[PDB]
């Protein structure tokens, strides 16, 4: 909801910046072997436990 503590807000801000795919240029690099970022999440499928 609208009321939040400072500690809860920083957790949300960090959880929101980490939630991104692999940038499209990295895929062209000779040494790079990852397909998809397995740390990506959806609000419909997991809980953060920020509480």
């Amino acid at each position: 909801g609208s009321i939040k503590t400072r500690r809860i807000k920083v957790q949300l801000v960090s959880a929101l910046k980490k939630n991104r795919c692999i940038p499209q240029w990295k895929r062209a690099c000779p040494g790079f072997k990852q397909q998809y970022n397995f740390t990506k999440r959806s609000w419909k499928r997991k809980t953060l436990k920020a509480c």
Binding site: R7, Q11, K49, C51
Partner: protein, 89 residues
């Protein structure tokens, strides 16, 4: 009834993020953390050997301890501007 309909009432939250260990296990009413016993001075007894090795020295970064070993190897040389203080001592 004790199944599905009772699940609807479960909207309160007894644990929050502990400031010593990070583990979302500080019980607000009891005033105690269930992972690390904060605010007691010592850390909690861990239940078994498997579980305690997950939090030992060397599981994180060891920043200070690594530098100390390199300095000991070198013979504790110190900052080269101040050699005269070292040599006197």
């Amino acid at each position: 009834s004790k199944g599905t309909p009772s699940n609807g009432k479960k909207n309160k939250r007894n644990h929050t993020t502990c400031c010593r260990c990070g583990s979302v296990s500080f019980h607000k009413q009891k005033g105690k953390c269930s992972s690390c016993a904060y605010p007691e001075k010592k850390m909690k007894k861990m239940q078994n050997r498997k579980a305690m090795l997950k939090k030992t020295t060397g599981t994180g970064k060891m920043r200070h301890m690594k530098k100390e070993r390199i300095s000991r190897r070198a013979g504790y040389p110190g900052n080269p501007i101040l050699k005269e203080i070292r040599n006197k001592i």
